[PDB]
Design a protein around this ligand. Structure first.
Ligand SMILES: [Zn+2]
Ligand SMILES: [Zn+2]
Ligand SMILES: [Zn+2]
Lengths: 446, 448, 449
């Protein structure tokens, strides 16, 4: 499964076992709730049974009215999308004349139908709740039969269950301005969402993937309010569809790499800034700089190409030889020699500088390693916690073998006299350019 | 309505049709809920009916006890406010010297009153729910009368219905350390919120705006737990008051602009960094750099002046002539020749460099444009998606005319040999000055 | 009543000193178990409303069980990367092993609290907070099979949905969060359950009293991790904060940009301290929190997380009293961006007013009572209620406490605008002096030659 390599030379680590599930595009469905506009109830009197049904009908009638009022490091390199552009684009089409009537007619006999909208796009539609028929054909008839003092108390409770979902939906949208993420259990129950996946135009491998991770799918989905014309409430559900699946993926962890002299100043530091998730797709490598935004379950990675850059395969060369000519690896430089630790998939990188106390501890044995100054690594095999200064990090206990690639720290090849100490997004070649400009200009004057 | 102007020379676009709704200050109201403190019911029984009221009384009593325990790019330029300082200042006034009795007696005859507090501040107070009369004078008498075994299952259900709102209010406060935003429908029902707007000392133009956008109003509001002394639960509701309405607003979109030469390295880049929302305000320009925090409904923009800078009107010149001397436009420079796209209101900016495949497609026609190297623009008229590398962007489909301003790319005026390639918040004049300073060391020393 | 604040005109910053520490230093993990019966498919034919509710509820419960089974299967950049739930998950991984539940299940059959040693050697406390099995299997279903699914008394169905309700919310929270919840809700751990868990935690009475009086903050620093529902047990891990540093001095540093105040629109020079945030001394060094948002304040106590800190030498305070001191090189950033702004402190407001901006401080009764000139100034929250900087209206904190004005000449006046390096995001006073010295030498040495 998962493995890990720590490169001592550039103070970074690569975890390799993972598999992709990249969100590549969107699927939009139209969800409808058929609900009825009720005429004024003539049930006077405060008989205890009566007050409950009148109160419940009133909660429903207000909820409809409430709904009517409501309808009226390198992250900076990424670029700016519009998360709900697709679903909103579908939502606006539903406003056109007799589009609801088409949807309404399509779901008249079943609860699922494919409708060709006026713009030509065919979308799945679902009737997930039928309060129109329940109220008009079961509840109100029982009220007239029993003259509003219901003999059988269970029918009012049967209504209260049906009505709660419409009340929770109207409560959520009252607070979200009609666009929510993740999509709630009231908007789409778990069984409904699983059912939409079976009917989506994707391979069984994709259907099986989504069905086994509905909670991830749910979190990557949007719920867009659309209309309440006629007797219908309609909102668009925007689902992620994963167009790239099961390609190899790897995560890069990076930490500052500094010289190890104890004197307070005069230390110089260097950090790889390309930390994040890498997944090769379609002959290229997709890079996700904010690895927090990617969600991992088992050994499969769900990222979103909205948060990616599309890079040449040669990026991989930065891990093995940072100075290679084929790709200019991104680095940052400073004189701030602060101690910290980065917990990786299968261990921990410890950048220990200055006078910091740095230790690795076992749950049973106590402290079992004290670090020297510099960037080092420890496997999660014998180690349970790592303590850097006053910070105690627990280590990941995911199983897998890690291997330490010894090497001379890269920072030793720079002398502090010509080293450019404020560069936030420089490269291997860019630092050399500033060194040669600085090494010639100072030398030439003498 | 809305329009959009794309400037090819500086690789940016401006969306212009919008109208402002700026949060300018706060309005604080006190919401009170009347509660009865219940003593431990000495009600034993293994009847399913009795167990139901006992569970409900216990659920209510714990909520009271739960509430009792509760008593004890250019974003960095912005500056730091204290969001709920106004509401907290009101809440603190409620803890001292029995101020609740004043509210409690003021709300004795109606459910709405204006109270002048110890500090002199007059605040609206509202009694939104009277659970005391139900519990102490209808329910518990029935319990002691029928020896805790309620005959009618409806009496227990009415209780759990009456009891429900207090339980959710206490839930929200339990999970948010007594400060919630947005303000929920349990905190303030939709009908209650519309009524408070009518009672606020603001214009009908302000009242009409808030009333038609409660879902935004709720999102810009805070609900602050204050006290539960003397059979009263009180919390402060902090509502936004919109002091600037209907002034022109425009959003600036920017993307990196790089040279298009074939050499893989040695390419140069330049990006405008003042992206964000600008709303003309009181003779100046209020700038909101983090456009996520602003909310747009139809063609109306709700922003928060807490997240703004107040700038001279001359800011606008960065859109028309970036090199003018009167205002120093902010930029960043690099050699990081990466491809990306920025989706605008009415189209998409495509920054396509290197060997990346960049295309814009229509839902019916397929691919309809292949982009060349450089920063270009596309209207959302015929285009539905834009694809940059392995990233597929859907374009915004709002109607409006977008307009293309031809121009020579600004970055071509620099030679790559003296270009300062790592400037994170530089300006037009600051970059010119570092080249000018670097041009001096060469000319005077070399010809020497 | 020990909260105070000092404003340093010299470097346009302010320090709030009265506070007390409560740092999360590590984690305590317990396993919470709920006893469940797996309900097999009911054979209820009939459309009587009573049957309709019973069947509706039984299917509602079965969905939750099925749903839960699906679940088993400035200076922030310097901080470093933790794994927040690595500890809780490590416990959760062990519970997946064959028959680890039986160890748990037998330990809690006679009481509701027991310590179980797992396969990996870890002894962890386990708690049974709810027994839904006995109601369903020995009270509800027997009545169903006896009365041929036609329930006589509607009270038993309302009894059921109430018994069933908590498990339904627990499964909802997990279903929407991919099995990891924070803060830990009252459905995950009721208020009395948590207070009881605190008593059994391996901590001092100072720690128990601290956590017991701030459960709502404890909840905000806790995680709840779904693990298993095998063989009539639902188990999830609750990850609780244990506060290893308590009642040590803490102070908040507020900083603002400091610029020259000349009338010329351009050509101004600026300078800002970047070490704003919360500071707490603990083990003879100073734990620094640059992201003051992650720290929560209740009255005079600061709840922070050592995961979001840097550990710095005690010499950091030297930056507050004499920024040019030799023992620590204070971090600052430099710019030419002459923008007006305001930073509200604990006991007042810093007003950095530059250019032509209208800057004002007002009282609720008197109206406008002070207009600021160009430069860095300060105002106490005593007489002042609001502060207006340009078109932004700031309300000031009204916490009681004395603030004091440390008069001094702004540091920015000691630099000449001609040699000032104006693009530095994390340089130091000495690093900038060195850039002045390298540039002052090239100009001085060239004139001699
Ligand atoms: Zn940890
Ligand atoms: Zn030029
Ligand atoms: Zn129990």
């Amino acid at each position: 499964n998962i493995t890990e390599e720590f490169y001592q030379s550039t103070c970074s680590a690569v975890s390799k076992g993972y598999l992709s599930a990249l969100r590549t595009g969107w699927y939009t469905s139209v969800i409808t709730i058929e609900l009825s506009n009720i005429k004024e109830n003539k049930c006077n009197g405060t008989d205890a049974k009566v007050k409950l049904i009148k109160q419940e009908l009133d909660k429903y009638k207000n909820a409809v009215t409430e709904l009517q009022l409501l309808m009226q490091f390198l992250g900076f390199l990424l670029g700016v999308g519009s998360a709900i552009a697709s679903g909103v684009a579908v939502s606006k089409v539903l406003h056109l004349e007799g589009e609801v009537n088409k949807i309404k007619s399509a779901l008249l006999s079943t609860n699922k139908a494919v409708v060709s909208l006026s713009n030509g796009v065919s979308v799945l539609t679902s009737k997930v709740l039928d309060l129109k028929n329940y109220i008009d054909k079961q509840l109100l008839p029982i009220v007239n039969k029993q003259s509003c003092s219901i003999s059988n108390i269970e029918t009012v409770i049967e209504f209260q269950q049906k009505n709660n979902r419409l009340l929770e939906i109207t409560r959520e949208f009252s607070v979200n301005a009609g666009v929510t993420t993740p999509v709630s259990t009231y908007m789409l129950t778990n069984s409904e969402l699983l059912s939409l996946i079976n009917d989506m135009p994707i391979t069984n491998d994709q259907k099986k993937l989504m069905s086994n991770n509905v909670q991830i799918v749910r979190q990557q989905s949007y719920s867009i309010m659309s209309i309440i014309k006629e007797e219908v409430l309609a909102y668009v559900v925007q689902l992620p569809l994963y167009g790239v699946i099961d390609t190899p993926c790897w995560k890069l962890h990076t930490s500052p790499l500094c010289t190890t002299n104890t004197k307070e100043g005069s230390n110089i530091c260097l950090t790889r800034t390309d930390r994040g998730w890498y997944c090769d797709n379609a002959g290229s490598v997709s890079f996700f700089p904010q690895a927090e935004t990617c969600k991992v379950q088992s050994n499969r990675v769900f990222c979103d190409t909205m948060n990616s850059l599309t890079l040449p395969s040669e990026v991989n060369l930065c891990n093995v030889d940072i100075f290679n000519p084929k790709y200019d690896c991104k680095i940052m430089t400073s004189k701030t020699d602060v101690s910290s630790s980065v917990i990786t998939s299968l261990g921990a990188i410890v950048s220990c500088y200055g006078k910091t106390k740095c230790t690795a501890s076992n749950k049973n044995r106590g402290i079992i390693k004290t670090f020297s100054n510099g960037c080092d690594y420890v496997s999660n095999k014998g180690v349970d916690t790592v303590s850097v200064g006053n910070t105690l990090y627990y280590v990941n206990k995911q199983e897998g073998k890690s291997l330490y690639v010894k090497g001379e720290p890269i920072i030793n090849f720079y002398d502090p006299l010509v080293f450019p100490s404020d560069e936030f997004d420089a490269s291997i070649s860019q630092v050399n350019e500033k060194i040669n400009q600085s090494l010639a200009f100072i030398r030439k004057s003498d």
